[PDB]
Amino acid sequence: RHLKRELKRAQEEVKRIQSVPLVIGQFLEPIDQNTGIVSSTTGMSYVVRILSTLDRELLKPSMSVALHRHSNALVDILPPDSDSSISVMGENEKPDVTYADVGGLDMQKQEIREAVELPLVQADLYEQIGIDPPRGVLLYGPPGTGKTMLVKAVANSTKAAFIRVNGSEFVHKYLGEGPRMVRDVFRLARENAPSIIFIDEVDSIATKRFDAQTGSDREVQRILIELLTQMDGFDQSTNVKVIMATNRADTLDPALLRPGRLDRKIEFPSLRDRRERRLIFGTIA
């Protein structure tokens, strides 16, 4: 009965170490399970003991985590929903464009209701036939085709989480900032599945020619390599794999467009016919 007093005084001690002030690192992988490798957010690797009596159920896949200050020890885990680069936008109000303002481009509208909308609501039609749904969606054309207008149209009607970012949000400016944000975006999406991820322009990141003689080429390049390895993990999750767009498709790096990441290429014509130009006039009129 005396030792039940002593188990309580030892339990108190350790809960104070769990709590604030803490720096936030990331868990890469275990080397045992009582010891792991974390990269702090100073751009260095540390080998740290792991507080036994913790959940490794979400821990083993790479995911944010809390560390102690001087001690440097993993004293608790953080939700993959928490410490994210961007709050989801599916909870904010919906984009202002609806399908009444889409006029023409009716040919690309039947290839986007199939590729995006149908695999979220009904995963069970694809699997029972035995076909694999298209993975990533690419949009490309001249810079006026109103690519973004079609994406807003599909964002109002689905009423599922949305995550909207750019490809200069990932811009390098601290050490190791660029690789860190790519992890946060793919882990939020699995957590609140289903969802549609849009990267608006990705013309600067995908470069056909690197030389890697300057630091700024080594940050662009670490980001892009990380982006391929996270599109692989993203397979077999209800989320329809990342939509992305480019204005000039002829700078596109070859590993990105390769199958296993992007499969569909929705070209956006600009000639069109007389029945599809009429509609564009009719909604602006």
């Binding site: 020619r209 690197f210 890697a212 003689q213 080594r218 390049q221 892009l224 790096d253 070859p254």
Partner: protein, 51 residues
């Protein structure tokens, strides 16, 4: 797959290269990685249809 070759598709892609950062002068290093990990098929697709 039957012979148990490492299928290294080489291509002109510098995304994978990070140690020298260009394959214009990489010869010995591709050999010395593929000689360790023999057997190997270096699948040199030279495009030669770029206009």
């Amino acid at each position: 797959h039957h012979t148990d070759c490492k299928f290294i598709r080489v291509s002109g892609a510098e995304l994978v290269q990070k140690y020298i950062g260009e394959g214009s002068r990489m010869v010995r290093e591709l050999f010395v990685m593929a000689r360790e990990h023999a057997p190997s098929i270096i699948f040199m697709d030279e495009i030669d249809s770029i206009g």
